[PDB]
């Protein structure tokens, strides 16, 4: 039962550590701020008064926290003691912060996996929770029963150290997105006096064509041919105005739907007016 | 015999919505204003009208599908004497304004009027996934029920208001068409690795499921003013978005989109949200500087 050591408190690194727990892994917990996680050793952790301690205690050391910098700032004082260890890094930043981190590793004979959870706290130790990792593979095979006691969908994408964080970055710029469209759409209701609750069932709908649309636009993109016969691009451009245009009157921000129709514009200008939605990629890689 | 039905408007779905009168054996007329549309729906049984008047002259109900209430009003204003006694349906997305100053025309020239929205594409029209809003005269939807239902399972009479239905159709489009410039982007981004689109859209599949239960849990949070953060907070989350935005700039991508997120957000922090969740962002949406 392999030890493993969990630095960074935060919530998820707190979900992270609990999963180990749960698994039967001797687990060793450490975070910069004291006090957090009172639950984790009554359930066994044990806390590490230092960094130092807390890697010496584990095989496999998992980082999360906010950023690169932060993670950096830990990892570099103790890279001796990093020595014969499989460092693990899931926390969420740019493929050239996974790439530096990844260089460092190699410089100080430390196995590295470059990761990224890309679930919500209360989904990990769960089958369908998915994280990412990228790096040594050799060390992702040893350790695999290890990191699924996370998620049952860890995927390896690649020995590249950077990879992962093209996974993660790319899948957390459509959520977040997303979820900012969401918030946006049931205020613009609100304004009207419509409350999310009566928005929300009909928005079943729209999560089933972004389940089409994941497929299509994937495609088209990938094959740079955008077919906009049955749902053009100008008329979509029309809609998005009228949506931008009734927000700014109802007092909303509107900044990102500004965006989406500036984009979008930006595309038609480019002649794509009687293109798909999925020709505003082209709008994406050539700004004005 | 079968109530005969006008589609004014053969765009994607204006023809769209004529297949699905057809497929049901309404008598259907149609009329566009560019010549050369639909000729697939006369081979089909439908009869093309030389103008909207004639046009409107065959139908019991008329639907209107076109890009705007600039093109429907200039198409429907000149032709009021023979919509008259008729069941006008307008499905053109746009705003609630709009909408009711069409209503307040329909009245005020004794036309029975429903406005409405389609809220999914052509393929999906005359199907079980298919999803229309009207609003307006509850007797014209209840007598014509039978009719607009041959277009979609889901016909969602919503009230009598006749902008009701622009402000459902506007509120979920705000929705639907961030997410599918989200989508489109971060594509993009995952390219700039060389990482293809075909790559992404297996694991795209998990953050679908994220969002088919944040709908729900983001629409309490809203209408209770309840944005609890503890296992997510809203200043983690503008780090996590401002990594993306960084990535992407330096990969020379168009970020309009991503600051936008990301200063709602900021907004939110600044007005008390930083340990709140995702649903605090609200307050940014609401109260921008
Ligand atoms: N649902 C989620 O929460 C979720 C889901 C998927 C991915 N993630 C990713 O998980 C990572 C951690 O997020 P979280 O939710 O756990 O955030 P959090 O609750 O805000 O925790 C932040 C963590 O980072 C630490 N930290 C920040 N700056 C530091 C510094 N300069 N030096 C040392 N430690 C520092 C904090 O330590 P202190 O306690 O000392 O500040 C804490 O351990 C992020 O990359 C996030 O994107 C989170
Ligand atoms: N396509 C979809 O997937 C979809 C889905 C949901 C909702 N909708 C809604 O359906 C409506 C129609 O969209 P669509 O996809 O059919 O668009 P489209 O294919 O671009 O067709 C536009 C239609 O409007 C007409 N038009 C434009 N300006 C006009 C004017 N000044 N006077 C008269 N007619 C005018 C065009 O006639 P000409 O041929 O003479 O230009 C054509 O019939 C929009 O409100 C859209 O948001 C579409």
Redesign the interface.
Known sequence: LTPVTVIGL??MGQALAGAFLKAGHPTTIWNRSPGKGEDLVARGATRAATPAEAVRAGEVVVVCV??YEASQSILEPIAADLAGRVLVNVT?????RAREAGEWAAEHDIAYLDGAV?????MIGTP?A?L?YSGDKAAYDKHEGLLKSLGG?S?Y?GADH??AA??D??????????????????????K?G???????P??????????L???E???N??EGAYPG????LA??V???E??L???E?R???V??????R???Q?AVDLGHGADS??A??E???N?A
């Open positions: 935060g919530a906010v950023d969420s930043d740019a493929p050239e890309m679930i919500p706290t209360v369908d998915l990412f969908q995927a994408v950077g990879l093209v996974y970055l790319s899948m957390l710029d459509f959520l977040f997105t997303s979820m900012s469209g969401l918030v946006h759409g049931y205020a613009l209701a609100a009207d419509v409350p999310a609750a009566s928005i929300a009909f928005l079943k709908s729209h999560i089933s064509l972004l389940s649309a994941v497929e636009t994937a495609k993109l990938d016969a049955e749902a053009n008329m979509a029309e809609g998005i009228h949506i245009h009734a927000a009157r007092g909303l921000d900044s990102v739907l500004r965006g989406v500036d984009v979008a930006r939605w999925s505003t990629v709008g994406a890689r700004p």
